[PDB]
Amino acid sequence: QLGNKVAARNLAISVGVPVVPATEPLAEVAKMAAAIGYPVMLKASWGGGGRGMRVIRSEADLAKEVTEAKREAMAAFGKDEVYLEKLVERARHVESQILGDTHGNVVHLFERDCSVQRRNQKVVERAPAPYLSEAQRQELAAYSLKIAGATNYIGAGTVEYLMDADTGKFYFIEVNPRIQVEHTVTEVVTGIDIVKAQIHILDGAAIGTPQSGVPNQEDIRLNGHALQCRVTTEDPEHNFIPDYGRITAYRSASG
Amino acid sequence: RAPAPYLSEAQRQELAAYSLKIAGATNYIGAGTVEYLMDADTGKFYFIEVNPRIQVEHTVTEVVTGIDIVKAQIHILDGAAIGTPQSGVPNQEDIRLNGHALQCRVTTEDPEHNFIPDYGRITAYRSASGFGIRLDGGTSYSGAIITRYYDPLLVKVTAWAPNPLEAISRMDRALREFRIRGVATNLTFLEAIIGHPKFRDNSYTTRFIDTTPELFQQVKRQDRATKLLTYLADVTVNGHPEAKDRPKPLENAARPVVP
Ligand SMILES: Nc1ncnc2c1ncn2[C@@H]1O[C@H](COP(=O)(O)OP(=O)(O)O)[C@@H](O)[C@H]1O
Ligand SMILES: [Mg+2]
Numbered sequence: 383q384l385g386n387k388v389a390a391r392n393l394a395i396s397v398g399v400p401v402v403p404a405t406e407p408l409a410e411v412a413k414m415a416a417a418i419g420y421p422v423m424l425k426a427s428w429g430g431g432g433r434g435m436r437v438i439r440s441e442a443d444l445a446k447e448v449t450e451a452k453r454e455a456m457a458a459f460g461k462d463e464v465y466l467e468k469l470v471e472r473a474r475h476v477e478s479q480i481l482g483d484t485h486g487n488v489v490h491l492f493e494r495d496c497s498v499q500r501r502n503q504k505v506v507e508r509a510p511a512p513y514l515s516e517a518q519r520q521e522l523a524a525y526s527l528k529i530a531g532a533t534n535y536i537g538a539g540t541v542e543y544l545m546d547a548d549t550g551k552f553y554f555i556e557v558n559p560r561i562q563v564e565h566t567v568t569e570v571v572t573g574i575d576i577v578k579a580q581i582h583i584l585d586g587a588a589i590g591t592p593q594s595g596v597p598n599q600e601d602i603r604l605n606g607h608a609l610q611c612r613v614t615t616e617d618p619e620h621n622f623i624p625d626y627g628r629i630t631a632y633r634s635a636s637g
Numbered sequence: 638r639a640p641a642p643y644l645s646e647a648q649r650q651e652l653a654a655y656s657l658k659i660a661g662a663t664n665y666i667g668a669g670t671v672e673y674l675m676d677a678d679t680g681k682f683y684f685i686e687v688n689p690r691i692q693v694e695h696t697v698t699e700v701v702t703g704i705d706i707v708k709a710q711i712h713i714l715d716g717a718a719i720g721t722p723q724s725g726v727p728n729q730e731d732i733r734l735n736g737h738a739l740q741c742r743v744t745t746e747d748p749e750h751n752f753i754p755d756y757g758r759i760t761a762y763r764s765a766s767g768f769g770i771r772l773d774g775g776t777s778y779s780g781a782i783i784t785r786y787y788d789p790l791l792v793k794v795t796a797w798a799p800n801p802l803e804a805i806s807r808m809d810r811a812l813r814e815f816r817i818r819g820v821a822t823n824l825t826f827l828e829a830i831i832g833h834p835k836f837r838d839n840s841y842t843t844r845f846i847d848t849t850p851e852l853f854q855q856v857k858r859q860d861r862a863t864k865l866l867t868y869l870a871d872v873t874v875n876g877h878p879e880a881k882d883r884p885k886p887l888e889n890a891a892r893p894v895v896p
């Protein structure tokens with residue numbers, strides 16, 4: 383339901399959560415793309431690895447590009463389904479963290495900003511999204527609970543959205559039905575162990591009880607701010623090519 | 638530990654009110670601690686002494702209240718006012734407890750030799766992090782040489798969780814995840830304290846360590862890898878007595894393959 387992006391998007395349309403205008407799956411794209419309008423972002427349905435995407439600015443580009451986009455999606459993801467989505471030209475990436483149990487309770491652990499991106503891959507993530515109003519933040523929290531309730535969501539997953547910088551509108555983009563690399567920032571500002579929750583949950587536990595590791599929605603409270611960086615061997619002075627071999631000395635910093 | 642988890646909210650408020658009166662009646666500037674004894678029989682608290690400074694244990698109060706104590710010290714001596722966003726500190730009313738913490742200090746004090754600190758080269762050093770774990774180290778690292786002249790301290794470990802039992806097992810997980818080689822540590826002794834029933838159910842007095850032992854104390858270590866390497870080196874250099882003067886298998890013949 384959430385694996386395929388079109389099916390996921392259709393899910394959200396069905397429970398009243400906003401989306402960007404997107405086509406059906408794709409040898410005559412526009413007509414179709416032309417109904418959406420340019421510019422558009424081409425996205426692999428299924429497989430969403432922080433990118434097999436492509437911005438198409440005009441019809442003359444379409445033929446080479448969709449084809450290429452397809453050979454790649456088959457390459458990287460192995461399923462080959464692409465659809466066109468209307469491009470949000472100026473965008474912030476915000477996302478809701480949700481926990482659902484085997485008994486139908488679902489809670490949000492507020493949002494993260496992950497707009498710090500390198501060609502659509504997440505680089506720096508922050509909790510809460512610093513530039514949000516208390517009401518926008520409640521607006522998002524409520525969509526993600528409608529998305530989770532809808533799929534009787536069991537465990538941890540993430541609901542991701544594009545904020546349109548020009549209007550401050552939200553548009554559901556995808557679900558990740560899994561823990562994420564950036565979960566950690568949500569953990570330190572809420573005090574809630576997401577992994578222990580995962581396990582308590584499939585043990586059959588009820589969210590809101592001590593043995594679930596998860597508070598009732600009303601006792602889930604934001605405390606400060608946090609951000610996460612990933613240290614890699616990608617060498618800034620050598621085209622970010624990943625270095626490797628032996629680490630001979632290593633001292634990380636705490637406190 | 639922080640908070641002290643055996644206290645009633647009446648005893649905490651009672652304790653905290655005495656402290657603002659020892660402090661106000663000296664116009665104390667900076668950070669300071671007011672120590673009390675508590676008779677476990679009556680639950681009655683006795684003033685004992687004041688330390689006019691940050692203590693080794695400030696980190697637990699930091700993680701449980703989210704107030705940087707060092708930064709408060711500097712801000713305060715810059716002239717800032719308690720309450721101001723630009724002091725370190727919120728108003729009393731906005732000062733709040735959040736879950737639980739305990740600190741253990743990892744050292745070279747040897748349990749297996751009466752707690753004399755060990756000294757020498759640290760050949761391996763890995764420490765453990767993750768959610769709810771704070772470390773205050775910087776002195777140790779592989780290669781480092783522990784001298785006999787100062788403090789035996791290697792690193793201070795602070796573990797946070799929403800309740801005290803979960804904090805104990807967070808500490809227990811991080812402690813046991815530590816690998817320190819080249820020198821002796823107090824890790825086993827730290828692990829025994831925190832795995833103790835009297836610790837888990839908060840019924841220890843100050844006489845607990847000097848009393849419990851229950852030697853604890855001991856059990857050794859297998860050190861199997863080193864043993865195997867010893868064997869391989871021995872047979873590699875000297876040969877095996879059953880094989881060394883007898884015919885030899887045809888050189889690099891195939892390992893057997895399990896069908
Ligand atoms: N329709 C769009 N318009 C503008 N930018 C987009 C659009 N769709 C995706 N992006 C950018 O690509 C990123 C990844 O999108 P997402 O659907 O989560 O793909 P993935 O499955 O690779 O995570 C988003 O954070 C956003 O920055
Ligand atoms: Mg994504």
Ligand SMILES: [Mg+2]
Nearest residue numbers: 672685686687
């Ligand atoms: Mg004293």
